[PDB]
Design a binder for this molecule. Structure first.
Ligand SMILES: CCC(CC)O[C@@H]1CC(C(=O)O)=C[C@H](n2cc(CCCO)nn2)[C@H]1NC(C)=O
Ligand SMILES: CCC(CC)O[C@@H]1CC(C(=O)O)=C[C@H](n2cc(CCCO)nn2)[C@H]1NC(C)=O
Ligand SMILES: CCC(CC)O[C@@H]1CC(C(=O)O)=C[C@H](n2cc(CCCO)nn2)[C@H]1NC(C)=O
Ligand SMILES: CCC(CC)O[C@@H]1CC(C(=O)O)=C[C@H](n2cc(CCCO)nn2)[C@H]1NC(C)=O
Ligand SMILES: [Ca+2]
Ligand SMILES: [Ca+2]
Ligand SMILES: [Ca+2]
Ligand SMILES: [Ca+2]
Lengths: 388, 388, 388, 388
């Protein structure tokens, strides 16, 4: 039977640890993939950790230059959540240097975007096997979520991006059924910039918090019905949640325009909670260090700065990076609502550390009905390694 | 269908080897987790070995300082009983530096206690996924069994501890249904001290033999009905089974007060056999070396010192440590009673041995209807390793 | 139920990446088999990568002299497609230094040809276990496809070769039911030479594109009905697709005779598309470097040189080698036709590279309904390794 | 449903390769157990390779002194047939320095004999979990088959030995149901010596070819009905099949007395074929080198030396050792008879080779309806290793 994602998001007060794989501590000795862009998505029965291997292993010469973004050695693979991307537990999913994946109830669907920058191709897999394709429509680095896609009653939805990195690109939504694409929509976002959308089910529609790599230090927001009529804009909250951003007092919020004049960005997430919003952001406003998630009273619908709850997952002396969203299916949590959950990627090595390589580990969190104490579940690996 | 644990414990005469993983011999070369606190628990169809990784691997720099108790790299994982905690066979269970886990018939439930000492959080998993939480109630190192919890007809029960290590702490019982907590009880044990309870089903109620880290060299006993009305005290037996303890002749037994004035303690187990009790204790009365289990005529209900049976599992020139309890479900043994079984952890390295690390291996035993010869199935690994 | 392969081949316009295992990059450090002759074949539910281990591992002394073709250490094993032939994921299939394997709907059948050259023996497995045998009939290196066999409604068909390497050998077809051989046919190909046939289902019959190691620089073609009455000849196309071959202008095509007077050859594939043919060939006309696949208007039935479509999978500065065919069962693709798919093997080391060993990696491709951009998904491993 | 082994043994003409694991070639680099006594046994759906680890790994210091026979680090584990005993694929079966295992149709039963020599204990497992026990009855190295036991319609039968190694010991038969022992029989063999019985189903009864470590250079034979009334003696064949033995001409055969006055022995097998017998023996009459199997016309019932068929599996310049029996269940081969199959162990290292360790690999064979060419599928590993 097709899996339900009609339900409302559980209003949550705090987040509790789901997992931590220790891939890089472990990788010092064990056989673990050099990766980046880890993410999570769940089936009726398990939660899995997708990721992009650099086609090589930690502590090996082949991990040299693994800070590069797009190589033909790049693949998408998966493991049981909390397990490290070690060679002997990773399932093959797709060739990809940009990806997304989710479950419709019956099988896994995955999108693998590889190829030359001018002409990338996204290969849709369903049941492990290629089913459909989208070729680059704008000829400049076709790319997508790097976090779980979404499936609401058998049909799956996700967001991609083609175009320049620091100017107006173009944003499309896609809809498929059993690995087969059955619809699409071009997003009208003049003067806006949408990348790496962290989405989730909610009230029967798809809500994504995405990244502005142009000017905004606030995050684009895209709310998608199944008929593909969307509504697009930014996270109302008067608090900047990109990185880099400016200070909180020094920020004016907007549900409509992008705000701040800092370039660049980082992947991040938000969860609408009725009217409030849980937002994640690296602690450091400049560097990809630390992590913390804030509940803001009415920060989704209104430009509020009212932080009702704060919690720290990675402290500021520790590295982090990307973070994103996914939900536990009702068939997994037994809850009458879709538990909000997230994960943080924790990058180590180059460019900041004295290694020939770049990789990352993760900690997954999940929404419980109480406040959880602050702590720092960091990567915790000693650098350099021996290959360095 | 929900699994039965109504049954009576098989009166057993001796214990026969269930398994031995050789993790540290194997770990010299293979990829095995640095761990401690191994334990066992069974499903309708398999027996599994839970454990706490130090988020690192044997023979690796990251195994340095792995004598520490609570790090954020700490996780709970599982394998098939007798298999070593190697990377590629370990399933992820929870983030934990203190834990317990069991099966209700339908899925696995696990409790993962991590966080800062002042404010620990216990994350209940069921079916791999977080379902409920308990925050530290006394602000000092929330902790639990480090041995299998217990599930009697679909509802699961276990014992935790918050408070100081060597004075009056506070002890709670918890009850849950499918990862969801549905009841609790505060244990009244003034002048008593309950830790690391080794429990099991018996006559339809939960019986635990726990650790006194305060003064007692005998072990607390807690007998728990499903309505959460308990009865608490010590193991009547006139023989001390903690470590360190004093000699046997130099010991007065009590079902009520703690006895001996030695501090400290170690995790251990007991099995009520009608009126008698099987008790495990490290051979050495001072050091964590050797192991042996004694049947005492009427040592559960009365303060007897009558050893009807003795058996040695690890000899005194060999290291050991923690030991605990679990049962084979009727759906596994075919017996009309719940076979008593136990395991012994065998610690090696720091603090006693010339290594940068600390870890342990295990041998599981099980109740058969005959006396079994003495022997010593020790860890048997050659120290130091190369990383040392 | 027995699996269908009655259907027609999907007319495809371009091919999109199915997988890439990175075995040799990975093998630098991880535990991967030294292999050659990888290939693919699918079940109702998964696609698997068969291969021939050299009974040893990459970066190990035992990988010395692994350029040899036939050793008693040679075995056939399998993994999930896209996974590398690593020790801990490889299933055992058969002892073989030449092989083929496929699925009939119920279980896997595999043929393992090992033994001395003068008297080889092919062991048919079905369900993992030996079921039937064929002894060498001509006493000179009994051998077969090194690419998936074919199963059409419960009965499986494949092609073997006994005899000299560079003169008239002898070619047989075999037919079996559940690992049991129920028919055979001697192919009459005087002055022709058939080896390493790359086959697939199509319209209810078996079509193979094979290798001419005698004189032809075009490829033998064998079309096989289930009654074992075949029709044999060469690929009409006026373009040479063996290696080595001569130039395209300097080639006269023939559906009947072999063409070119270059000896040797390499394994390769073709897909009939109604009247046109997709053909693969290494880019370099002399060396086993690069790869590319061309659709030729009416090149199957007529001696045409009309290339309607071109696509490059491995560029000419990169190594490749063998390539072959297989299809995705309708029960896997949901398509009303059997998606054509192929894979390319990418050899590295000896004889061309400064290593003591020889091995290879793979990229699998699959037929989609659009043109896919050119690129080069090469092996990408840095040579020599440390063992060298 | 309980599995059938009523059937007759397929009269076979030759044996064809089932598998070869290459454990020691592979072990040079990969993580493989140091072992001995490998053996095979099949379930309705798979064939598995049991073995005795030395609780350590190849190329590791802990493999020192692994020529010893009985250590407490010794365990029994299993893998899919043809797979090597690598850490990450081995299932745990039992603690054992002597063993046997088989399948009754529903679950696996295994016997694990460990402990001190004077008082060994055999732990019966069924479904992975300990179910029954037999204590040493004669106080001198309780031991058993080291090759598959036998299960005929739900009840399982096997043979053990207690007593001295080179004089009269004592031999018992055991019968169990679902890991539970329901019968036993003392074998009357005055002046005879039965060890390491290689058994199999045949006509509804159990037939074993065992080892005489006393005086016989011919092999004891024990034919066992399910009521436990046996008939015991030696293999009639006038050809010696132990090792060491004397020449063939210099041998008088006896179905009754032991023959030859050479001490010692090695494990080996025989298959009754109507009246004839397939017998295996190492080629060298003195050393454990080479292997070959001979069909002898009427060598089971009469003292014949008529070799109708010969076949060589390992040549005489290559090491071998133990060999034993098992059958493919009808539910696996589809044959109306139980295909005879065997395996040969191939020992390497100490005492004969320049290594600190001793271990072995295997090749499994199986009965097909034709003669198979001679060859030598030897271990093929280069010695010493690096640890040496
Ligand atoms: C800075 C450019 C950014 C916005 C378009 O792209 C992502 C930026 C990035 C980041 O860390 O900021 C990650 C994405 N990425 C990284 C990689 C490999 C990282 C290896 O260390 N592959 N994709 C990049 N995406 C792709 C498709 O290349
Ligand atoms: C000595 C303190 C004792 C009583 C409260 O605690 C356990 C004592 C201990 C022992 O060996 O005596 C083990 C428990 N522990 C150890 C570890 C890591 C051990 C790594 O070598 N994590 N928890 C300790 N528990 C926790 C939650 O830290
Ligand atoms: C050049 C001879 C060719 C035509 C008969 O045989 C294949 C040629 C070959 C190739 O690369 O051209 C591969 C086949 N082969 C290779 C190997 C091992 C390769 C180890 O590097 N086993 N079989 C060879 N087949 C066998 C059964 O030995
Ligand atoms: C020479 C004594 C023989 C007859 C009683 O015993 C077997 C002889 C032997 C052999 O190779 O001849 C193998 C059996 N064995 C070996 C081992 C470990 C071998 C490690 O290299 N464990 N049991 C031995 N059995 C046991 C229970 O120790
Ligand atoms: Ca930005
Ligand atoms: Ca104490
Ligand atoms: Ca040719
Ligand atoms: Ca003998």
């Amino acid at each position: 039977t097709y899996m339900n994602n009609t339900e409302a998001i559980c209003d949550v007060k705090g987040f509790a640890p789901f997992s931590k794989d220790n891939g890089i501590r472990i990788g010092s000795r064990g056989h673990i993939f050099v990766i980046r862009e880890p993410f999570v998505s769940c089936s009726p029965i398990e939660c899995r950790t997708f990721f992009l291997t650099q086609g090589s292993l930690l502590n090996d010469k082949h991990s040299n230059g693994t800070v590069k973004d797009r190589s033909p050695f790049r693949t998408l693979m998966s493991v049981k959540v909390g397990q490290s991307p070690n060679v002997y537990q990773a399932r093959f999913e797709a060739v990809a240097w940009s990806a997304t994946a989710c479950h419709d109830g019956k099988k896994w669907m995955t999108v693998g975007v590889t190829g030359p920058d001018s002409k990338a191709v996204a290969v849709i897999h369903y049941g492990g096997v290629p089913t459909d394709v989208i070729n680059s429509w704008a000829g400049d680095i076709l790319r997508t979520q790097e976090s779980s896609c979404t499936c609401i009653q058998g049909d799956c939805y996700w967001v991609m991006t083609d175009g320049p990195a620091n100017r107006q690109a173009q944003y499309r939504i896609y809809k498929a059924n059993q690995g087969r694409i059955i619809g699409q929509a071009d997003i009208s976002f003049n003067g806006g910039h949408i990348e790496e959308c962290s989405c989730y089910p909610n009230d029967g529609k798809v809500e994504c918090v995405c990244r502005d790599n142009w000017t905004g230090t606030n995050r684009p927001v895209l709310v998608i019905s199944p008929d593909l009529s969307y509504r697009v804009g930014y996270l109302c909250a008067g608090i900047p949640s990109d990185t880099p951003r400016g200070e909180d007092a020094q920020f004016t919020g907007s549900c409509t325009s992008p705000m701040g004049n800092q370039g660049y960005g980082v992947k991040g997430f938000g969860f609408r909670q009725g009217t409030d919003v849980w937002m994640g952001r690296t602690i450091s406003r400049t560097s990809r260090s630390g992590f913390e998630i804030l509940r803001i009273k009415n920060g989704w619908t209104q430009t509020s700065k009212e932080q009702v709850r704060k919690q720290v997952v990675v402290d500021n002396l520790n590295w982090s990076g990307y973070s994103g969203s996914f939900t536990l299916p009702v068939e997994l949590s037994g809850k009458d609502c879709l538990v909000p959950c997230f994960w943080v990627e924790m990058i180590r090595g180059k460019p900041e550390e004295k290694t020939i390589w770049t990789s990352s580990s993760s900690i997954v969190m999940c929404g419980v009905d109480y406040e959880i104490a602050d702590w720092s579940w960091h990567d915790g690996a000693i650098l350099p390694f021996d290959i360095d």
